[PDB]
Structure formats: structure tokens, C-alpha cells
Amino acid sequence: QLLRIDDHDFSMRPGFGGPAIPVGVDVQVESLDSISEVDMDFTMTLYLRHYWKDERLSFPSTNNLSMTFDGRLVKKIWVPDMFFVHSKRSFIHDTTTDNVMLRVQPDGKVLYSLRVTVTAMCNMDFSRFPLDTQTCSLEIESYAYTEDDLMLYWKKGNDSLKTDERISLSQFLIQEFHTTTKLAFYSSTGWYNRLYINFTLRRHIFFFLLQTYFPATLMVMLSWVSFWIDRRAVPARVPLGITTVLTMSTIITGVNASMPRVSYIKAVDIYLWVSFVFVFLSVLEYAAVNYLTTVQERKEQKDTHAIDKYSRIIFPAAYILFNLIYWSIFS
Template structure:
């Protein structure tokens, strides 16, 4: 190690052979009496550090952690009178110096006030660029990757616009010793950057001063840049709004299904509610737990309520459907309607003519719950007692114990032999659906779409 150290040292003869105005000698002369522990203009005016940033990449905002990540070139420029190049220097107006010399110079103690984590790049060499100008100006450029906090206001999520800051502050020097100043013109250069969920434009960048006061130590210089990011709602339109809207519409199909078809209507309503609840749970896991209601929450809750309301509507229909009083009232209404239709219908039917021109007469008979009818086309038919058992008669036939000419028929405990021949088991009677149940479905077909449309008009007018 000692041999290696000696081999890197220049002998007195070697130094004598180097011209006095060479770059090496000039740099050595600059650092002979230079103390990096003392700031420029010590006990004098504060050092003005001009700052500018070039953004290489801009990561998308993370809603769960409320931060964003950037990769930048941070550039700082200040004047150090001790580093003025001598008059005998015949080179260019600026020296490009090896980054190792950066450690030998005084430098501002800049840090990012809202930083969560950061790393310095050193592949393949330390990513530092150092210039020393003839008048003593020093320019340092370094490449950094930083994760910065960005408190989000998600009230309008996902139609929100976020303002994320980057604050550059002095750690140890007060405003009496150091001041940060944004470079005139465009202090933050931003290439065309495409973010997956946000739009960021150069004209939306704002600059400001955020000098802070800390009790007991004083004021510390601080500058900030504010990025305005507008969220793109396309992803949420296709991934959240459209599917949930279709699920709500799907729940309305139950209004067109027969009220007594519970095997079809109940699963449809349950599927709608469970699908919407699952969507709410999935999105809640992807977003921070905030105490206020977001725009997306309003939409999902409304969709969930509409889906649940369609299920409740069918429960009300079922109550109407299984209410004995309403069922009996509906049966009475139907019987009354059939009786009214039968009086007019029988009068017309008694003298109807069949396809052969023969008069046709209808006779009806009811024994207990058994309904019978007979079609008479001749006098012999009138004298017979052949009645056919049917489960139900047309609504225009009056169920009464009269023959084809309206004469009363004596009813025995059982049917005649001729009747027994035609004795067939009647088909099951169709369930009686109360008018109120039908009316609820009818109203729901119009009311639910209208209310949902009205909600959409209000919702999008507020949040868009």
C-alpha cells in the first residue's frame, strides 16, 4: 500500500516540469488554502444557490401509500470567490472537473423536505458533473431517484386532480447564510412523459417559495415545485362504471319475470347484489382508508342500493302473492268478471251455429269442485246426460246447474254412468296472482330506470 501511495505522488522535479498555468497546477493552487468547512462569503452576504431540475421519468401516483417516484438531474449553481481561476489560465471559461474533487469543495446542504426515500446513482461511475467557471461559479449536476410524499384529496376520485409538491430545503444553514433561488426561465424541464393514469403538462407546473421557520433556530430557505396531475378516467369507466351499470340493469330483468317464478327471480337479484358488493370490496382494498366519501363510493353505494331495492321489490311482490285476503279478493274479482262475461256470452252462444249450420247449445254443470259442460247440437243431445269434466271453462260460460235450454238439472251425490265414462282428472288450476302484485312489477319497470337515470344526471353534473 505504501508503494502504491508513493507511486501516485509527484516528485518535486515532476512538479517543476509542469507549467504553472496548467490545469493541474491551477487546481492545486485553488485548493492550497481552501477550507470546505467554511461557506463562501463567510460572515458576509448569504450564498445564493440557483436550482433547476431536469425530470427523466415520473412514476405514477400510488393511492395506497400517497407518494410518487421521480428520476431527476438536480443542478445547483453558486459563486465561491475562492475558486476564481487565475488570470494566467489560458483555457476555456469553465473547467470540467473530476467528481472526486466535489468532496473537497463546500456545497449547499440541500435536502428534499417531503422525501420518503432516495438513492444516488453510481453506475458505472458516480453520476456527478462538476464545472468550475472563471469567475468562481460552481455548477454541480447529479442524478437522483426520489420517492416523495403527496397527500391526496380523493373526494372526486376517480375524476380528481392532484397537486404534488417537491420541496428543496436547507438543512443547517439559515436564510442568513444560504438562499435557494429557482433558475429564471424554466427551472424544471420536463420531457414528454406518459403516465398510465394521469396527464401532466408543462404549463401546469407551478413554482413557489416555502421558506420555513423553526422555533429556536430561525428561518430556513426552501423552494418548491408543484405538479398538477389530472387523472384519466378511461380505466375506471371501462373497469368499474360500465360493469356496475350493466349489473344494475340486469337486476331490472326480474320485473319482467312472472311473479310466481321465484326460482328465476331470486337468484338474479342475489347475483346482482353480491356482484356489486364484491366490486366495492375489491376497490376498497386498492385505495387508502379515508374518513370521507369518494365519488366512486357514491356510485357504488347507489348501484348497490338499486340492486338491493330490486330484491326488496320482489319480496314485496311475494308478500302480495301469498296474502290470503288478497288472493281471495282476486278470485272473487275474477269470478265476478267471468259471471258478467258469461251472461252475455251464453245468450250469444245459445243460438250459435256450427260449421254444418246446426244450432249449437251449451249446458254447464258444477258438482262440488267438479266443473262439467255439454255441447248440444240436437234434441237427442238435450235428453242425454253426457257431460264432459273440465278443469276450467271459457270465461264467457256461466257455471250454473242448467241444461242447454236453461232448465234446472238435479244434482246427485255422484255423476251418472255416462259421466263416469268421461271422468278425467282436471289439470291443476293456475295460481291466482293478485292485481296489486302485478301492479308493483308494472310500476317498477318504469320507476327504477327513471330513478337511476335521474341519479346519473345529478352524479355526473356534480363530479365531472
């Protein structure tokens, strides 16, 4: 055997009872799988690498080059115990074998790599939905060893993060990849060191505009055509107004089916409900005209009405002003 595995007890970390052993980390991101709004989490697949030195794995050689083993010797030597904080579920690929790489240098330097898929939670805000921007992060920490036994740091600082050129999302735009570092404290175990991977996401507005905003505007303009119809056709104008109200209500209900039960109103809800009020007022507009006409005929017994003439101009002006204000605030 090139390595004297049986001659050492690997139940203790290198430098047991002494100073902490530094550990390096390199991360390459492969792809992002899915994002859930109701569950507020994301899925990521990445390659995780570790760097440390152990004199117990030294072997004699003359070339001074790294040597690669099959990978099943990992379960017989000491390995760090990094874990993902605030994660919901994760696993390691095992086809056709465990995705494990083990390279040992003659002086004892060890390279360890893994391929994992991790799901982590992220707190999102939907105040500006669907024109919002979300930021999420991934955390890496050691579970068992504190800062007095193991020191965790990025292997090459800002250059330790790499991303595949094929990473893309159908509904989101990915940008601003960077890493940071911060300490963590637990009241009953001590202090630990954490590593962060940050990114930013931006939605695409084309789908929401075509599916929600355009149908809403068309329904509002449909109610305006009743002002150009003669008021004597009562069974012809009343159904027009009512059907528009019912259609607008159906549109509002269908939008909320794909969003969670938040406690605050979203930007899309404001636009839909304001449009509902405009259509509702249109129905009441004809009711006033009909009542006044009946009273006028009764008084006389014992042309275009003024309300209709002014409604032709006031209603389009108010809606256009609302759009200018609404789109200026939300850009």
C-alpha cells in the same frame, strides 16, 4: 497542480464571518416513476445544478474558458448542503462512477451538477375519486446555513425549470409546471429560504368506467327482466333476484381493495351503493306480490298484478333520473 487545494482550509464557507454568498439553482426534470395512493408519495428523477463563486479556486490562464475536472476533487473543496424537505427516501447514482460534474472558470466561478432520485410525500384528496385532480410539489432547502450566511434563489427565474419531452404517465396527465419561492422559520435555528416545483395531475376515466360502472348498470337492468315473467313461477324469479344482490355485493367489495381506509365516502361508493338499494328493493317487490296473491286466494276460497305493471315503468324512470343528477354534479 493547477489548483492550490492544499494551501487553503475548505472547512469554512467563502466570505466567512461576512455577508452571505448567493447560490443559483437550475433544475431539469427527467421522468416520473410511480405514484402510490396508499402511501401518498411520488418518485422523481432530476438533474440539480449549483452556481457560486469562490476566489480560492482561481487559476491563471489566457483563454478564459471553463475547465472540466474528473469530479473526485469535489470531496476536497467547499460544497453547498442542499436537501429535500418532506422526503422519505433518496439516493445518488454511482455507476460507473458518481454522477458529478465540476467546472471551474479562471476567475473562480464553479459549476456543480448531480443526478438524484427523490421520493416525496403529497397530501391527496379522494372526495371526487376517480374523477379527482391532485396537486403536488417538491421542496429544496439548505440544511445548515440560514439566510444570514447563504442566499438561495433561482438562477434564471421562470426559465430555470426544464422538462424532458418523454415524461408520461400511464394513468395520469401531467401539466402546469411552475416554480415559486417562500421563506421558512424554525423556532430554534432561525429562518431559511425554500424553493418549490409544482405540477398538476389528472386521472383517466376509461378504465374505471369499463371495469366498474358498466358491470354495475348491467346487473341493475338484469333485475328488471323479472317483472315480465309470470308470478306463478316462484322458484324461477326468486333465484334471479338473489343472485343479482350477491353479484352486486361482490363488485362493491373488490373496488375498495385498491384504496386506503379514508374517513369519508367517495364518488364511486355512492353510485355502487345506490345500485345495491335498487336491486334489494326489487327482491322485496316480488315478496309483496306473492303475499297479496296468497291472501286474495284465501279470501276467495273462504292476469298481471298491479304492482308488477307499475314497477315496469317506475323503476327505469327512477334510475335514469338518478344518472342525470349524478353525472351533472360530477360532470
